[PDB]
Amino acid sequence: AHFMDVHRGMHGITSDQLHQAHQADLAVEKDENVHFEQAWADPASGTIYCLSEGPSAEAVQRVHERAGHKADEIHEVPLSA
Amino acid sequence: AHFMDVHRGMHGITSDQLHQAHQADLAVEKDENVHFEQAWADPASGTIYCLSEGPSAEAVQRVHERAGHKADEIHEVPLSA
Numbered sequence: 743a744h745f746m747d748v749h750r751g752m753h754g755i756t757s758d759q760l761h762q763a764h765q766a767d768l769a770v771e772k773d774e775n776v777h778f779e780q781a782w783a784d785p786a787s788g789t790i791y792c793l794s795e796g797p798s799a800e801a802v803q804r805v806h807e808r809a810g811h812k813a814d815e816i817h818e819v820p821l822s823a
Numbered sequence: 824a825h826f827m828d829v830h831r832g833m834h835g836i837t838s839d840q841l842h843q844a845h846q847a848d849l850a851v852e853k854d855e856n857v858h859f860e861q862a863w864a865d866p867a868s869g870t871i872y873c874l875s876e877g878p879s880a881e882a883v884q885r886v887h888e889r890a891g892h893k894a895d896e897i898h899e900v901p902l903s904a
Binding site: 744746755756757760761763764780781782783784785786787789791793817818819820821822823 | 825827836837838841842844845861862863864865866867868870872874898899900901902903904
């Protein structure tokens with residue numbers, strides 16, 4: 743399944759910090775059969791969007807939690823255009 | 824510049840409805856040099872995420888308005904991983 747998750751409150755985040763966070767997810771994602779495909783961040787509002795594939799939102803969130811940053815919101819996105 | 828925008832209240836949206844909404848944006852995006860890259864929808868939560876390239880959030884929103892669906896939230900996402 744496909745998921746979009748959102749992290750809020752991240753104002754001022756740098757490219758280095760976003761890379762670091764994404765690498766932390768990648769380091770433990772395979773245990774849960776999750777793959778984080780893309781991350782996009784707005785340092786002004788402090789909003790990070792993460793697109794993943796995995797068996798469930800629960801699995802995606804367990805990966806994030808191990809990586810140090812559980813998402814504030816997660817939605818399955820079964821439709822795409 | 825790169826933008827992520829969010830539409831809420833789209834409970835129960837179908838694949839056909841998402842496809843047509845995306846087609847409507849694509850039909851008028853050129854005028855504003857806006858380029859919608861991908862859309863993802865969650866019919867359960869009623870959330871649509873739209874990733875685009877355009878000159879500004881103002882331009883992206885003018886396109887959405889013409890296509891009949893101004894986004895509830897729009898963020899420049901200058902960082903990606």
